[PDB]
């Protein structure tokens, strides 16, 4: 089910090009949404499940909603030199299909 | 890239309990949204990339937006008894990340 996920991660993995060992909170969104399936969503899946559609150029169409953050909040941390820093809208605080 | 997709498909593949020798337009959304990534999406892909986030139960989280339909329009056809019918909100008329 689509919901908010929470874990402690090293800021050096946040891709913010930051050097630092500090487990900080990082929340995000994931889970299923197949239950938010519309009539259109149902027909697309039916066409795809029968190979009735030809693959559009690129990535395959997705036939249900996507669990995605709807709200956000900053992520603070102590760097290598022990100084506080903050990156806005980095962690999610609410989700939705 | 995230754009509207248009094809001709048999109503029978529409999965709606109808057989019909009638091809009908059916448009849908699909494509890359790696362009509309949020800052949270970058730190997210990085974490997953570095394997610093442990797989939440079920479906893995998307690190970017999903191309999805924003408006719909009905799909009409002539059923086996050559009788006109329509199904509201069956086809996409606009997409968005």
Curated annotation (Swiss-Prot), chains A, B:
**Keywords noted in UniProt:** Disulfide bond, Glycoprotein, Growth factor, Secreted, Signal
Tissues with expression: Ubiquitous. Expressed at high levels in peripheral tissues including prostate, placenta, pancreas, heart, kidney, pituitary gland, lung and testis. Expressed at low levels in the brain.
**Which cysteines are disulphide-bonded?**
2-67, 29-95, 33-97
Locations listed in the record: Secreted
What are its GO cellular component terms?
Answer: extracellular region; extracellular space
What is the stated purpose of this protein?
Growth factor that supports the survival of sensory and sympathetic peripheral neurons in culture and also supports the survival of dopaminergic neurons of the ventral mid-brain. Acts by binding to its coreceptor, GFRA3, leading to autophosphorylation and activation of the RET receptor. Strong attractant of gut hematopoietic cells thus promoting the formation Peyer's patch-like structures, a major component of the gut-associated lymphoid tissue.
Quaternary context: Homodimer; disulfide-linked. Interacts with GFRA3 coreceptor and RET: forms a 2:2:2 ternary complex composed of ARTN ligand, GFRA3 and RET receptor.
Q: What's the protein here called?
A: Artemin
List the range of the whole protein covered here: 122 to 218 of 220
């Amino acid at each position: 089910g689509c919901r908010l996920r929470s874990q402690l991660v090293p800021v050096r993995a946040l891709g913010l090009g930051h050097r630092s060992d500090e487990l900080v909170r990082f929340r995000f969104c994931s889970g299923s949404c197949r239950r938010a399936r519309s009539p259109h969503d149902l027909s697309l899946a039916s066409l795809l499940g029968a190979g009735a559609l030809r693959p559009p150029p690129g990535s395959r169409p997705v036939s249900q909603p996507c669990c995605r953050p709807t709200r956000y909040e900053a992520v603070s941390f102590m760097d290598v030199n022990s100084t506080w820093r903050t990156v806005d809208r980095l962690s999610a605080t609410a989700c939705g299909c």
